[PDB]
């Protein structure tokens, strides 16, 4: 066999950490994305892009460090180190937000490499590649939130910054500006995530509480053998319990486990669709019938109208410091406030 | 009147809500943590104005 | 009209619960 | 079961700790000095506590020009 | 910059002591494959 | 016309019916508010 | 409430079209030998 | 039986009925195009390309007919506002009719191919089994695609035998269909150079012709045939879906940022033109040139075209809409009637004050007025008890130059405040809100709706690519893994190379 | 199966199912064209992005 | 002519080719030395 | 007779070596005063 | 080979982690990031 | 034309409900054993 | 126990065509009066 | 919307004519 097949042999050796052809893409990009995040959150400022401190070196903690997006004036520049903005200057590149695109782009190709890894390993051990298919949901979320959304907006500045508190700000921005909780695609996401967590808990608990006694120990974990032919728990008893408790129960184990893939994966895909809309400010912001009634009838109030007042406060009170390129000056008298507060 | 300030919030479908905006509204701030069963109200009309259904549910 | 529509869909779901529970395909051990 | 030496074997051997009693503290001290010499500030362009603002300036040095942002930061830094 | 030699010399002195105590076994592994 | 050998019967069992109707009805309960707007 | 006049027909067909699709498939499954 | 999500797999081994299904799908798409054009013609108002162009009216396929040279109606109007034009057959109506007739012919061919599915052509002469030689089919289709691509660029876009394409000035004031010469230098790769579109189709077409001939005449290498499963039609579905989502992301991007193929007179302005005050800068440039030439303020502003002023208005920004705010932009702010003219605000001292414009991000926005240096000088307060900058305290007036209100001045504070509220949207227009019962809430344009649908479809088709690519490469295990799966293949240490029985230790 | 006049004319075009060239065939040439195409897409992307800025190429409505 | 960003483009293109070239040369070299036994 | 320098060895040190360096840096930072 | 018992390595390594994380919490109250 | 707003849903349901009734009965007739 | 009174139901193709014609023509007739 | 409704029903009728003629249950002598 030729050099390609010799290379294929070495790439697919059974070792502690499997490499594979996909590893050529995955390992550099994953390592650089992670290394970029640790480097930036440890040493790198956001003073010139956001007017923020964002690193351990400046005094931030694990919750407040971030690798922040570039300034809005960078637009959607790839911000390559050798590009026209940094012109090869590593220090300037960091000050300009170059680590943000570095992490986002290497992270994107790393995620491609990881899903290729799932295909490659499944093919080598001889299993169907449903794990790779389930991973399309993380990828749809990453691509829609970190790439499509800022690409629809004015610049990378409005992408999420890579940090704990930075992400929290992203949540609150989406409430105040997009009314994102009102969006039926986000609601489907919530259902998929919370339903996924429910299925996770309920399935694990059911298996663990319909186990057969397959050993003498009061700690029951040792009474299982991976190569055994027999089910380790009673599907029949599990089915009767839930039929009598809840009204319906699983009876087909293949359907049950497919459903566990389907629910969270579909939920994440739906949330991605909503975010693609928010890229264009195509929000579910209002109910027109509500606004017409409320505008004409000052005694009409719902929780929907209450939440918009919260949104209006969020926008007015957060925009001047959250969007410094806009140079907003809102004199005290224009700020929306209720009584006393 | 969720916040006890005589500013009643509409929760029900027949009173201008849809599935997304509708709610059973919490009982009045004037009640606080007081137990407010139906038989504490002078009338069902009072009971409804003050958010009685929320406590029962 | 909207209220009727919302309550109609809800009522169909409750009816569906009844049939899905009491008129389910019975689990059979084969 | 893939042929590499087991980790528990390695990290309980004297030779491992002869090596890493040198290498681990050496790396730690190098990282310390990277900060304590101030070198980390200049590699990454991070402001020291006395370098966020000039003494009387009240305006953050936000970058506002894509293609001359490099010179803009340079000017912002010379004003300190 | 002196600060690079002051920061890299700890890391450089560590890579020298680790090849020194692994040389009897690094060349041994090398001669086996080839 | 000779019979096409690629034809196959199609099935939808009762559980799939109940699951499908639930999906459809719950989707309608969710999206109807936005259709009325 | 001044709702969209097409909301009713939109909701009605959204329910009915896929629902009848499923009922058609279910019933012809039951009637198979 | 087959579950509901697999019913169409009966076509996998039936080339003739697969062609029938593809014909039926093509019939439905062409039928949609024809019906969509007829519906738009039944609702389009052609009487004002200045303030009521197609993109204000929710027109989706009309700009695509106009982009390639169909600009007239049999009823005598053209979309550039001409009267008494003769388009020949290829009016909007003729295009619609042609698509309806095509739909019908395709429907009939689908019936034939469904009934007469068992054609000798679809059988492998050796085995008698159904067989499509997909590698050679690719070459044939690529050759044809290349010829058509080349012909579109060399004859249609050039006007050499065809009408050309829509082109316009940088501010979308004088667009029309023109012949366009190819651009063969580096500016051909500028998305805003239409000559690059012409050069693309000539050059790519020739490349497609050559590659097509290659793929007709050279068989795939055995290594590639096996690895991509070229005997399996689902491999073609996988990579075709991949190509299609790439193309869909591209057209979403060029719609949102603008290019020579997404002109603003057909799809509306972009959001970035509002972000960068693109039209405001050109308006200001023209006014200053007029003043420099001796014009009065009224004359200078009266010289601004209403069409240019209308682009400088946030109600035409495609990033101001809502997912469930349906219909034409006219359904929101109304049918624009006339420019009111440029509002100039002044305080009692007589300083000119400027209203801070609303960014696209904000559903609502305060009214704040600054002097030329950005110093706040007046606003509309929320809390009143500590107001310092109210229009009443600062004696704010507004005078209009150009448009309907030219030469008028308003001093009544509520009136001045109402104009200031409109000025956060940019230039101020009078709208007919009655004809459509408009609700006063901004909606997006065809540019926005096109971008949304195609980005969403592109992302969904990524899943399709993943799914059918998986089905192709894992066909042997579609029904499950081998019942006698060797435990040594999945446990560590038995084989040196994963999944290779010949490397057993 | 059914022979038709058009089917007989087209028969040779659907006759080489499964035919391959030996081994790697033109794979190396294919890889070169793929590499050039990658560079091409990178060029047009960076022009659109204002990462690659060329004389006489003003990426704006103003050209 | 050749603008600074075109020069930058060539620098990036060459840098990526070097990284990929060195990567594959190293992997190929290693794969040739440490072959699987069959 | 186990090998010493393996893929696993490299993977371990690409993570472990910077981690210790970074932890020394962050430790030093705890004594910076404004 | 096995001269240093695994339980001592785990105990010492664990104590090292506690020390370094303890230092990080100390730094939350002193110098940069302390609000003072 | 100011037509009755319920005319559309009335006509749609008038067509669809009985048509769907017949389609159900036809298809489950075809699928019975032959 | 199974109910012995059950019977299968049938609608042949001609009846389907006849019924659809009846429904569609009735709808074509009555729709004008529904819109009014 | 009324015109669309009228033309839709008409079009469905013409489609039914097509299926009733060319996709009829074939008359068979037994
Ligand atoms: C599932 C997939 C799984 C795997 C994913 C793997 C990830 C691979 C990594 C890909 C990264 C793509 C980066 C795209 C950068 C970009 O776009 O950069 C944007 C540039 C456009 O530049 C922008 O252009 C704007 C408009 O300017 C124009 O208008 C202005 C105002 O008038 C001026 O006139 C100006 O001169 C004129 O150029 C502004 O100037 C912005 O500041 C500027 O950033 O387009 C461009 O480079 C190219 C645009 C055309 C091609 C776009 C295709 C890819 C993107 C698809 C998504 C679209 C989303 C739309 C929203 C939904
Ligand atoms: C496979 C692993 C991998 C992948 C997919 C990427 C991908 C990327 N890198 Mg990363 N990187 C890697 C490994 C990788 N990198 C490694 C190992 C290092 C350490 C050296 C880095 C260090 C690094 C830095 C410092 C930066 C990147 C950047 C980038 C981005 C731009 C790259 C580019 O434009 O190259 C262009 C080059 C090619 C696409 C190669 C083309 C090869 C073709 C097919 C052959 C043609 C050869 C050609 C003819 C040679 C002629 C030259 C001559 C004409 C002058 C892109 C996301 C940039 C970034 O993220 O900006 C935010 C950036 O600044 N990378
Ligand atoms: C590429 C597709 C596309 C695009 C971009 C447009 C764009 C446009 N259309 Mg056209 N149209 C299309 C296809 C399209 N159309 C098709 C296929 C038809 C036949 C139905 C029409 C028939 C049509 C009519 C009759 C009209 C338009 C009009 C318009 C304009 C307003 C659009 C609007 O308000 O949308 C509103 C969009 C939404 C409310 C989004 C809906 C999102 C769906 C409901 C979500 C579904 C989620 C799903 C249930 C979840 C599944 C979950 C599961 C997987 C678990 C706009 C220019 C209007 C116009 O102004 O004409 C002049 C108008 O009157 N269109
Ligand atoms: C060119 C595009 C294309 C084509 C020709 C196919 C073809 C096929 N698909 Mg794939 N697929 C695609 C894209 C495509 N797909 C995309 C974009 C996705 C992500 C959404 C998928 C995800 C997918 C899955 C998960 C599966 C398939 C399966 C199949 C096979 C059975 C399909 C079937 O019987 O459905 C029958 C469908 C119905 C009876 C009703 C579907 C109702 C839809 C969901 C709602 C309304 C759709 C509406 C009319 C669409 C308008 C067009 C739209 C583009 C605007 C068939 C080979 C199946 C398979 O592999 O079987 C072995 C299967 O499980 N596809
Ligand atoms: C068999 C046929 C099946 C029929 C199903 C019936 C439809 C049910 C669902 C309808 C959904 C849309 C209802 C909108 C409410 C409404 O009344 O619209 C009404 C609008 C028309 O808008 C009307 O226009 C009028 C003047 O022409 C007036 O302005 C009216 O006020 C206005 O309502 O309908 C449309 O525009 C439909 C076309 C939508 C095209 C954009 C779609 C792009 C999004 C695709 C995303 C895919 C996501 C997949 C996720 C998985
Ligand atoms: C082998 C390792 C491979 C690499 C992957 C390791 C990833 C770990 C990322 C967390 C680093 C946290 C850190 O260094 O905090 C470093 C900070 C440094 O502490 C900060 O130092 C500053 C110095 O100027 C200031 O003094 C701040 O006041 C002070 O908080 O420590 C803390 O915040 C204390 C808690 C940290 C623990 C967080 C664990 C969270 C785990 C979540 C899951 C992931
Ligand atoms: C954790 C305990 C509670 C977990 C939630 C219960 C969920 C539903 C019941 C799920 C269920 O049925 O459990 C079953 C599972 C096995 O049951 P056994 O009967 O074998 O053992 C429990 C007793 O009988 C003692 O032998 O219980 C445990 O493993 C207990 C572990 C105690 C561990 C020490 C105390 C807790 C320390 C915290 C551990 C954190 C989690 C580690 C993994 C992430
Ligand atoms: C960016 C960049 C780059 C790269 C770099 C890198 C690659 C780096 C890496 C780095 C790293 C690699 C680092 C690391 C670090 C680490 C750390 C810093 C850690 C810490 C940890 C901790 C602190 C822990 C904690 C905890 C947890 C988590 C849990 C429990 C326990 C405890 C609490 C302890 C390059 C040059 C290419 C180019 C330019 C750019
Ligand atoms: C037969 C014939 C004929 C006739 C024809 C015709 C008359 C046709 C028509 C056709 C048509 C008239 C067609 C239409 C179509 C349509 C379509 C196909 C549509 C679809 C739609 C869709 C698919 C949608 C979807 C949706 C919705 C609903 C909601 C929103 C979202 C979406 C967009 C997804 C003639 C005389 C020529 C002669 C020959 C024969
Ligand atoms: C307005 C919305 C309406 C949308 C829904 C409309 C489309 C519904 C199409 C359903 C098509 C069912 O297709 C139907 O398949 C069944 C098997 O499943 C076939 O049945 C065939 O197979 C079974 C095998 O068990 C045999 O008993 C039977 O004798 C044979 O004819 C029918 O001949 C066919 O008519
Ligand atoms: C909004 C529109 C809603 C309209 C709803 C329409 C309701 C239609 C209900 C139709 C019910 C048909 O009822 C169906 O009858 C068939 C026979 O015909 C039964 O079928 C039974 O008989 C046949 C033939 O002897 C056997 O092949 C089959 O095994 C047996 O179960 C099905 O078990 C039953 O499901
Ligand atoms: C990494 C891209 C894969 C491209 C594969 C092209 C291999 S090229 C191929 O290589 C064989 C050895 O591998 C030799 O037998 C043969 O001489 C040569 O034609
Ligand atoms: C199916 C109906 C066909 C009707 C054909 C009417 C032909 S009309 C004819 O068509 C040409 C189109 O380019 C014009 O150039 C020409 O001036 C015009 O008179
Ligand atoms: C009462 C102050 C003078 C009149 C209003 C000044 C703003 S202008 C006013 O704005 C309306 C939307 O609110 C448009 O519908 C209308 O066409 C336009 O005249
Ligand atoms: Ca009105
Ligand atoms: Fe399980
Ligand atoms: Mg500190």
What is the DSSP code (8-state) at residue H187? G
Per the DSSP assignment, residues forming a β-bridge with H410 are H398
Residue H72: beta bridge partners?
H78
Domain that holds residue H420: 271-448
Cβ(B18)–Cβ(A302) below 8 Å: no
Tell me if I61 is assigned to some domain.
Answer: no
Ligand 7 binding pocket mutation candidate from A200, A204, A208 (most atoms within 8 A of CB):
A208
Task: Kindly state whether residue I4 falls inside one of the protein's structural domains.
Answer: yes
For K5, the token pair is 């320098």
Angle subtended at Cα D33 by Cα D28 and Cα D38, rounded to the nearest 5 degrees? 140
For residue H98, the surrounding DSSP H or E stretch is: helix H92-115
Chains K and H touch (3+ CB pairs under 8 A): no
CB D9 within 8 A of CB H499: no
Atom from ligand 11 closest to the CA of residue G27? 35
- Residue H418: which residues within 8 A CB-CB, separation 6 or more? none
Closest C-alpha to O5, from M7, H327, H104, G18: M7
In chain L, the number of structural domains is 1
**Domain D8-79 adopts which CATH fold?**
1.20.5
**Residue L23 corresponds to which tokens in the numbers above?**
């230092």
| Among C residues 1-30, those touching chain G with beta carbons less than 8 Å apart | 1-2, 5, 9, 12
Where do the DSSP E strands lie in A148-280?
162-163
Task: Give the separation between CA H262 and CA H318, rounded to whole angstroms.
Answer: 13
Q: Which ligand is nearest to the CA of H317?
A: 1
* A172 vs A190: CA distance, rounded Å: 16
Ligand 6 binding pocket includes K32 (Cβ within 6 Å):
yes
Candidates K22, K24, K27, K29: which one to mutate for ligand 8, based on the most atoms within 8 Å of Cβ?
K22
Backbone phi, then psi, for I12, in 5-degree steps? -60, -30
- Among residues H196, A159, O7, which one has the least CA distance to residue N27? O7
Distance CA A19, CA A117 (A): 9
Does A62 reach chain K within 8 Å, measured CB to CB?
Answer: no
- Angstrom distance (rounded) from CA I32 to CA I28: 7
Q: Inter-chain contact E34–J33, Cβ cutoff 8 Å?
A: yes
Contacts of H300 (CB under 8 A, 6+ apart): H286, H287, H288, H290, H291, H401
| Count of alpha carbons within 13 angstroms of residue H333, beta-carbon side | 24
Q: Report the C-alpha dihedral over residues F4, F6, F9, F13, rounded to 10 degrees.
A: -160
Question: How much distance in Å is there from the Cα of J20 to the middle of ligand 2?
Answer: 8
Task: Classify residue A74 as exposed, middle or buried by CB count within 10 Å of its CB (0-12, 13-18, 19+).
Answer: buried
Instruction: Name subunits touching I (3+ CB pairs < 8 A).
Output: A, H, J
Q: What is the DSSP letter of H152?
A: I
Classify residue C25 by its DSSP letter: P
In this structure, the residue with its CA closest to atom 11 of ligand 5 is G10
What single-letter DSSP state applies at residue A221?
T
Backbone φ and ψ of B29, nearest 5°? -60, -25
Q: How far apart (Å, rounded) are the C-alpha atoms in residues H446 and H54?
A: 9
Q: What are phi and psi of D78, to 5 degrees?
A: -70, -20
List of residues 6+ apart from O1 with CB closer than 8 A: M3, M8
* HEC string for H450-483: HHHHHHHHHHHHHHHHHHHHHHHHCHHHCCCCCC
A153 close to A323: Cβ distance less than 8 angstroms: no
Distance in angstroms (rounded) separating the CA atoms of residues B6 and B2: 8
Pick the CATH number of J1-38 from 1.10.240.10, 1.10.3210.10, 3.10.20.740, 1.20.5.510: 1.20.5.510
Quote the domain boundaries for residue A83.
1-341
Residue I61: CB within 6 Å of ligand 12? no
Do the two chains O and M touch, given a threshold of 8 Å on CB pairs and at least 3 pairs? yes
Distance, CA of G7 to CA of H331 (rounded, Å): 16
Comparing CA positions, the residue from I7, I2, I11, F5 lying closest to residue H125 is I11
Comparing CB atoms, the residue among G19, G28, G29 nearest residue F21 is G19
- How many angstroms separate the CA atoms of D61 and A48, rounded? 6
Going by alpha carbons, the residue nearest to atom 2 of ligand 9 is H104
- Residues 6+ away with beta carbon under 8 Å from L16: none
Structure tokens at D50: 């006395």
**Residue A154: closest CA among A49, A280, A283:** A280
Give the residue numbers spanning the domain of I38: 1-51
Q: CA K11, CA K9: separation in Å to the nearest integer?
A: 6
Q: Taking the mean position of all CA atoms in its chain, how far away is CA H454?
A: 8
Report how far apart the first and last C-alpha atoms of chain A are (Å, whole number).
78
Domain ranges of chain J: 1-38
First to last CA, chain J: 57
Q: Hunting for tokens 């305080």 — which residue is that? A: H347
Contacts of N15 (CB under 8 A, 6+ apart): M22, M26
Residues of chain G in contact with residue H1, where contact means CB-CB under 8 angstroms, are 29, 32
> CB count, 10 Å around CB of H205?
20
The closest of H310, H316, H307, H309 to H271, measured between CA atoms, is H316
CB contact under 8 A, G25 and H4: yes
Kindly provide the resolution of this structure in angstroms, with one decimal: 2.1
- CB H445: neighbour CB atoms within 10 A? 29
Whether I16 maps to a domain, the answer reads: yes
């Amino acid at each position: 066999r030729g050099w390609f097949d010799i290379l294929d042999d070495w790439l697919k050796r059974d070792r502690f950490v499997f490499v594979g052809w996909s590893g050529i893409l995955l390992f550099p990009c994953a390592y650089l994305a992670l290394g970029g995040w640790l480097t930036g959150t440890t040493f790198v400022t956001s003073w010139y892009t956001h007017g923020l401190a964002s690193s351990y070196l400046e005094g931030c903690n694990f919750l407040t460090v971030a690798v922040s997006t570039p300034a809005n004036s960078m637009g959607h520049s790839l911000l390559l180190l050798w590009g026209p903005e940094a012109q090869g200057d590593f220090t300037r590149w960091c000050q300009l937000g170059g680590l943000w695109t570095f992490i986002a782009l290497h992270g994107a190709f790393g995620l491609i490499g990881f899903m290729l890894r799932q295909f490659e390993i499944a093919r080598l051990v001889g299993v169907r590649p449903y794990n790779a298919i389930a991973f399309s949901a993380p990828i749809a979320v990453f691509v829609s939130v970190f790439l499509i959304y800022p690409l629809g907006q004015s610049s990378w500045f409005f992408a999420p910054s890579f940090g704990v508190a930075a992400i929290f700000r992203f949540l609150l921005f989406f409430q105040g500006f997009h009314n994102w909780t009102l969006n039926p695609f986000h609601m489907m996401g919530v259902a998929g995530v919370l339903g996924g967590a429910l299925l996770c808990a309920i399935h694990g608990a059911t298996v663990e509480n319909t186990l057969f006694q397959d050993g003498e120990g009061a700690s029951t974990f040792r009474a299982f053998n991976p190569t055994q032919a027999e089910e380790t728990y009673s599907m029949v008893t599990a089915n009767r319990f839930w039929s009598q408790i809840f009204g319906i129960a699983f009876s087909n184990k293949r359907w049950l486990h497919f459903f566990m893939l389907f629910v969270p994966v579909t939920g994440l895909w739906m949330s991605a669709i909503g975010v693609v809309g928010l890229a264009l400010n195509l929000r579910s912001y209002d109910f027109i019938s509500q606004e017409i009634r409320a505008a004409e009838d000052p005694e009409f109030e719902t929780f929907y109208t209450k939440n918009l007042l919260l949104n209006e406060g969020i926008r007015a009170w957060m925009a001047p410091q959250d969007q410094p390129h806009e140079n907003f000056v809102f004199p005290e008298e224009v700020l929306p406030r209720g009584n006393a507060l | 009147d969720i916040d006890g300030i005589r500013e009643p919030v509409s929760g029900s479908l027949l009173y201008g809500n849809n599935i997304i905006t509708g709610a059973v509204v919490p009982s009045s701030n004037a009640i606080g943590l007081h137990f407010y069963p139906i038989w504490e109200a002078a009338s069902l009309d009072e009971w409804l104005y003050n958010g009685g259904p929320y406590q029962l549910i | 009209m909207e209220t009727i529509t919302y309550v109609f869909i809800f009522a169909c779901i409750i009816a569906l619960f009844f049939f899905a529970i009491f008129f389910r395909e019975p689990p059979r051990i084969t | 079961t893939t042929g590499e030496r087991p980790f528990s074997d390695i990290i309980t051997s004297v030779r491992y700790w002869v090596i890493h009693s040198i290498t681990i503290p050496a790396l730690f001290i190098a990282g310390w000095l990277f900060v304590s010499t101030g070198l980390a500030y200049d590699v990454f362009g991070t402001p020291r506590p006395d370098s966020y603002y000039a003494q009387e300036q009240r305006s953050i040095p936000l970058v506002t020009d894509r293609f001359e942002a490099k010179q803009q930061v340079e000017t912002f830094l010379e004003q300190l | 910059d002196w600060r690079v030699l002051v920061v890299l010399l700890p890391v450089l002195l560590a890579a020298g002591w680790a090849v020194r105590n692994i040389l009897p076994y690094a060349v041994k592994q090398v001669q086996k494959l080839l | 016309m000779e019979p096409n050998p690629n034809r196959q019967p199609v099935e939808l069992n009762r559980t799939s019916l109940y699951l499908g109707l639930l999906l459809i009805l719950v989707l309608a309960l969710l999206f109807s508010s936005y259709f009325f707007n | 409430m001044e709702v969209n006049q097409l909301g009713l027909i939109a909701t009605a067909l959204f329910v009915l079209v896929p629902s009848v699709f499923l009922i058609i498939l279910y019933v012809q499954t039951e009637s198979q030998q | 039986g087959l579950p509901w999500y697999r019913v169409h797999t009966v076509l996998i081994n039936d080339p003739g009925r697969l062609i029938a299904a593809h014909l039926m799908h093509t019939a439905l798409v062409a039928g949609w195009a024809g019906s969509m054009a007829l519906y738009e013609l039944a609702t389009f108002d052609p009487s004002d390309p200045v303030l009521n162009p197609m993109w204000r009216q929710g027109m989706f396929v009309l700009p695509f007919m106009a982009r390639l040279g169909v600009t007239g109606s049999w009823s005598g109007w053209s979309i550039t506002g001409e009267t008494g034009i003769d388009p020949g057959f290829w009016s909007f109506e003729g295009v619609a009719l042609a698509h309806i007739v095509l739909s019908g012919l395709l429907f009939l061919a689908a019936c034939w191919h469904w009934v007469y599915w068992d054609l000798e052509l679809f059988r492998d002469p050796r085995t008698g089994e159904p067989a499509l030689d997909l590698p050679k089919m690719f070459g044939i289709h690529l050759f044809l695609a290349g010829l058509l691509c080349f012909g579109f660029g060399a004859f249609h876009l050039t006007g050499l035998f065809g009408p050309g394409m829509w082109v316009s000035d940088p501010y979308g004031l004088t667009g029309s269909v023109q012949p366009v010469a190819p651009e063969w230098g580096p500016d051909g790769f500028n998305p805003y150079n239409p000559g690059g579109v012409v050069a693309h189709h000539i050059a790519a077409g020739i490349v497609g012709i050559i590659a097509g001939l290659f793929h007709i005449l050279v068989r795939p290498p055995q290594r590639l045939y096996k690895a991509l499963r070229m005997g399996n039609i689902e491999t073609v579905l996988s990579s075709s879906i991949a190509a299609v989502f790439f193309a869909a992301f591209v057209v979403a991007g060029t719609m949102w940022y603008g290019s020579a193929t997404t002109p603003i007179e057909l799809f509306g302005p972009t959001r970035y033109q509002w972000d960068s005050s693109y039209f405001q800068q050109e308006i200001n440039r023209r006014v200053q040139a007029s003043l420099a030439s001796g014009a009065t303020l009224e004359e200078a502003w009266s010289a601004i075209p209403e069409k240019l002023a209308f682009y400088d208005y946030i109600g035409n920004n495609p990033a101001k809409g809502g997912l469930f705010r349906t219909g034409p932009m006219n359904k929101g702010d109304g049918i624009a009637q006339a420019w009111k003219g440029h509002a100039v605000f002044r305080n009692k001292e007589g300083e000119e004050l400027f209203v801070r414009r609303m960014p696209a991000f904000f559903e609502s926005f305060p009214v704040i007025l600054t002097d030329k240096n950005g110093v706040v000088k007046a606003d509309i307060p929320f809390r009143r008890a500590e107001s310092k900058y109210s229009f009443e305290q600062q004696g704010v007036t507004v005078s209009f130059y150009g448009g309907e209100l030219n030469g008028q001045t308003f001093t009544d504070p509520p009136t001045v405040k109402s104009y200031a509220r409109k000025a956060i949207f940019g230039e101020i227009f009078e709208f007919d809100t009655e004809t459509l019962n408009s609700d006063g809430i901004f909606r997006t344009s065809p540019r926005g709706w096109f971008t949304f649908a195609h980005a969403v479809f592109a992302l969904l088709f990524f899943f399709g690519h993943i799914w059918h690519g998986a089905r192709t490469l894992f066909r042997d295990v579609f029904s499950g893994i081998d019942p006698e799966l060797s435990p040594e293949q999945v446990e560590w240490g038995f084989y040196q190379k994963v999944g290779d029985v010949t490397t057993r230790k | 199966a059914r022979r038709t006049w058009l089917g007989d004319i087209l028969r040779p075009l659907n006759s080489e199912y499964g035919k391959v060239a030996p081994g790697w065939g033109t794979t190396p040439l294919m890889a070169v064209f793929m590499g050039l195409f990658l560079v091409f897409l990178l060029i047009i992307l960076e022009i659109y992005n204002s990462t690659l800025i060329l004389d006489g190429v003003n990426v704006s409505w103003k050209a | 002519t050749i603008t600074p960003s075109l020069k930058g483009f060539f620098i990036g293109l060459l840098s990526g080719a070097v990284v990929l070239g060195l990567t594959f040369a190293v992997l190929i070299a290693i794969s040739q030395i440490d072959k699987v036994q069959r | 007779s186990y090998p010493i320098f393996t893929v696993r060895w490299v993977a371990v040190h690409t993570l472990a070596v910077p981690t210790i360096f970074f932890l020394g840096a962050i430790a030093a930072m705890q004594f910076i005063q404004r | 080979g096995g001269r240093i018992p695994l339980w001592i390595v785990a105990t010492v390594a664990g104590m090292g982690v506690i020390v370094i994380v303890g230092l990080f919490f100390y730094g939350a109250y002193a110098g940069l990031g302390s609000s003072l």
